């Protein structure tokens, strides 16, 4: 399980800080409510698509698993890369997802819990 403060520091290093006008708290909250801080976690979908990465990126549009119908693979990054032990691929594809135009509302966890809330509390006290 990834640490909270360490994940925030790694995300800040990667350059996701102040991406699309969103503080690190929003992203940390979204990841925590998406995969419980697990990059190896996967969830099936009724349509056959499977979420991948710590942020639970959907394969039908972002990563080409080869098992989901109509894979647009916009990120063009293999789902295995998101499944990797590192979080680089997840953040790289999440940058494109958020840059799509609709911001962080695309992810269900972010709208459910991370939207219009004290997201700064998640990163508070991490000495970053």
């Amino acid at each position, epitope marked *: 399980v990834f640490g909270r403060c360490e994940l925030a520091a790694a995300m800040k290093r990667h350059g996701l800080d102040n991406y699309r006008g969103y503080s690190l708290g929003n992203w940390v909250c979204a990841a925590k409510f998406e995969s419980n801080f697990n990059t190896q976690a996967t969830n099936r979908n009724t349509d056959g698509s499977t979420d991948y990465g710590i942020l639970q990126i*959907n394969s039908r549009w972002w990563c080409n698993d080869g098992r989901t119908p109509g894979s*647009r693979n916009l990120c063009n990054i293999p789902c295995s890369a998101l499944l990797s032990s590192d979080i680089t691929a997840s953040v790289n594809c999440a940058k494109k997802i958020v840059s*799509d135009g609709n911001g962080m509302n695309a992810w269900v966890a972010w709208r459910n819990r991370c939207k219009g809330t004290d997201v700064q509390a998640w990163i508070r006290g991490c000495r970053l």
Partner: nanobody
Amino acid sequence: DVQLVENGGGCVKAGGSLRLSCAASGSTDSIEYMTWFRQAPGKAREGVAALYTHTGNTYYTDSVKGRFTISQDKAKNMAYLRMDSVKSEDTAIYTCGATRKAVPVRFALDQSSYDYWGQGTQVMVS
């Protein structure tokens, strides 16, 4: 699990104002996109005015650019498409498509991405 029901439509004079109204029921929380697809005779289904329930960003096809306006209400889970400067080409059956997932912007007008459809409503221009 959301079932889409259309309302309005019908006969309207050229240049008149028509208010097509659509509704959602059931597990409407999962509702993400609401779009109108016109099934004109002898023509395949095509998107008209894509919409996002939460952000409210409105995306329109070049044909209906600057003419049709799409808006919705979060509490009443209803999205209605106002029509103005209607012409003969606008004559078609409009279907209130919907999706339970966050489709990309480029595919917002593509029916295949969507998962929910309603009963086609007739639209006439004199």
